[PDB]
Amino acid sequence: VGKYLMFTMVLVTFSIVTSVCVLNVHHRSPTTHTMAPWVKVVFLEKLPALLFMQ
Amino acid sequence: GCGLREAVDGVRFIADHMRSEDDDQSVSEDWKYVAMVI
Amino acid sequence: IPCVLITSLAILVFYLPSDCGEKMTLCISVLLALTVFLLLISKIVPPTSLDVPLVGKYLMFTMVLVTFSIVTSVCVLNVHHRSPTTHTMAPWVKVVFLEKLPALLFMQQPRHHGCGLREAVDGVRFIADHMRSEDDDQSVSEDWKYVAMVI
Amino acid sequence: GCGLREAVDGVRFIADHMRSEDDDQSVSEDWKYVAMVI
Amino acid sequence: LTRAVEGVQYIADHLKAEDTDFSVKEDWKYVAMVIDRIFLWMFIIVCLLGTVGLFLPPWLAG
Ligand SMILES: CCCCCCCC
């Protein structure tokens, strides 16, 4: 049980880091950022298909 | 006369401004979608 | 290991955007967690003053850093929520934060960019001027947001 | 000709849209006032 | 036409009224800011004065 709790704690720390990064991506706009073409190609075409985002 | 030209220019400016605003909003929605995918 | 996990989060506050409205939650939580672990250790070790544990020294240093980060985050939030109707951007603020520092940090501000007839013309002119002024105000607000991002 | 009628129709639609938005905002503010009173 | 000029006049009047209301709201925001600033000054003074006049004696004794 202690091993499982420690494993879940590490995972939740990772999820906090990822949540901060996701929030940073969400609050972007042309006034302060420019979307690179590869970001478009990957995250708006390919990865959404593999996840059945549509 | 002069007023007609001023009104025409104002309308054109309004249309261009709204077009630019729509483009910016579209880019913002693209960023939001990227975050959703991640 | 709990202390290492908590310390790993002490820096995330400076990547969190000011619009998400959650910087204070993160930095305050980090500080309180660090303080709690320092107190637990203080309960475990003897209360002698011949030396300090290395882990206690490390926790103390991290706590000071996080207090500094909280003060900085308050300042950054204050800068972010500035508008032309409450503040005026000094020219040196422009010169430094919008031009020089971004280049040093590899950031690059993008910088996106029968009377009825006479009455109608006046109204259209007023509408156009009103939208122009709104556009200028929005641009200045964007500059304040960018300055906060650079800090 | 047709352009004049089309433009008049567009302006009328814009005005009606703004009137509707104004009414909606007014009712929202009424709800806010009720909350303050409670 | 009459409809066009009436609509343009209404739009202009609506924008003017919205601008006036926004001005009053910004005034309220500035008043809140001023109150915050004055209490910031007072609390900084009190904090420093207290932390120097109530943790000075401990150094005197130690
Ligand atoms: C005829 C000009 C209408 C402009 C309306 C603007 C609404 C934001």
The two three-digit tokens of residue E20, written as one number: 């006036």
For residue C52, what are the CA distances in angstroms to C31, C37, C49, C59, C61? 20, 15, 7, 11, 13
Query: Residue B35 has which token pair?
Result: 């975050």
Q: Which of D6, D8, D14 to mutate to test the pocket of ligand 1 (most atoms within 8 A of CB)?
A: D14
Indicate the residue of B23, B30, B37 with minimum beta-carbon distance to A35.
Answer: B30
Residue with tokens 């005026």: C88
Q: How far apart are CA B23 and CA B16, in angstroms?
A: 11
Q: Find chain C residues with C-beta within 8 A of A34's C-beta.
A: 108, 110
C45 C-beta neighbours (distance < 10 Å), count = 11
Final resolution, Å: 2.4
How many angstroms separate the alpha carbon of residue C137 from the centre of ligand 1?
18
Nearest CA in chain A to B28: A29
Q: What angle do CA A21, A23, A25 make, to 5 degrees?
A: 70
- C134 in contact with B, Cβ within 8 Å: no
C-alpha distances (whole Å) from B2 to each of B5, B6, C118, D12 are: 5, 6, 11, 25
| Residue A45 CA: distances (Å) to CA of A38, A39, C109, C145 | 10, 9, 27, 30
Q: Which residue has the tokens 């955007």?
A: C17
Experimental technique: cryo-EM
Q: How far apart are CA A9 and CA A11, in angstroms?
A: 5
